[PDB]
């Protein structure tokens, strides 16, 4: 496509340069180009894909939240705030559909190993959850159920194939717990999931090498932060 004439190795190299330069839109385009070469991504490459799209959609979601808040105040006791909120919303939806399309056309069906399978299903739940945050029509329930089904399949695999301290297993639980709280109006399920996830991982920290799990340590702190915010 757009990145069709560039070597896969060059796209990966340029994705890493774009990350160092904080050019996440370029990083996402290079990683989409690399996925479109048709080869399975490695662990480092999967992280590059996720960071690039999480940063792009993160910025759009922050903007949508600001606009939505201004719009809510303007409708209390002109068309511009609504028009601009809809423009941002359509751009955000376009990015989520691009990620969901890559997941469902390339990445998910070819992922056989548990680590990659859970990683891509977590991403599918995340991008359906971002679409649910802005969904307001007769489609909202189906979008929410698509996020739930992706997270649930990922949870089923991670509990069977990964240790409780695996950062992908922990990150999935962190995000599925947030989905329960913010999207599915299930705060009790969100709290139970974060508590059991934290407790199970704490009991398994005895098996790990000292400087090998900085990511799991950071995710465990985020579960604790959410549990403090909610309880």
């Amino acid at each position: 496509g757009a990145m069709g004439s560039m070597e896969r190795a060059s796209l990966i190299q340029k994705a890493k340069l774009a990350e160092q330069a904080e050019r996440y839109e370029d990083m996402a385009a290079f990683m989409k180009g690399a996925v479109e070469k048709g080869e399975e991504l490695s662990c480092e490459e999967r992280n590059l894909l996720s960071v690039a799209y999480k940063n792009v959609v993160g910025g759009q979601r922050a903007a949508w939240r600001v606009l939505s808040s201004i719009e809510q105040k303007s409708n209390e006791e002109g068309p511009e705030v609504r028009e601009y909120r809809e423009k941002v919303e359509t751009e955000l939806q376009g990015v989520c559909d691009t990620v969901l399309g890559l997941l469902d056309s390339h990445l998910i069906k070819e992922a056989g190993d548990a680590e990659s399978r859970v990683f891509y299903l977590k991403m599918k739940g995340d991008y359906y959850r971002y679409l649910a945050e802005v969904a307001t029509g007769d489609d909202k329930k189906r979008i929410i159920d698509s996020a739930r089904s992706a997270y649930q399949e990922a949870m089923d695999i991670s509990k069977k194939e990964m240790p409780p301290t695996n950062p992908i297993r922990l990150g999935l639980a962190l995000n599925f717990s947030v989905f329960h709280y913010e999207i599915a109006n299930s705060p009790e399920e969100a709290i139970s999931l974060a508590k059991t996830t934290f407790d199970e991982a704490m009991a398994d920290l005895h098996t790990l090498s000292e400087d090998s799990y900085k990511d799991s340590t950071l995710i465990m702190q985020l579960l604790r932060d959410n549990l403090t915010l909610w309880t």
């Binding site: 990150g171 995000n175 947030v178 985020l222 932060d225 915010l229």
Partner: peptide, 5 residues
């Protein structure tokens, strides 16, 4: 907002 990763 709650934290996600």
């Amino acid at each position: 907002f709650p934290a996600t990763v």
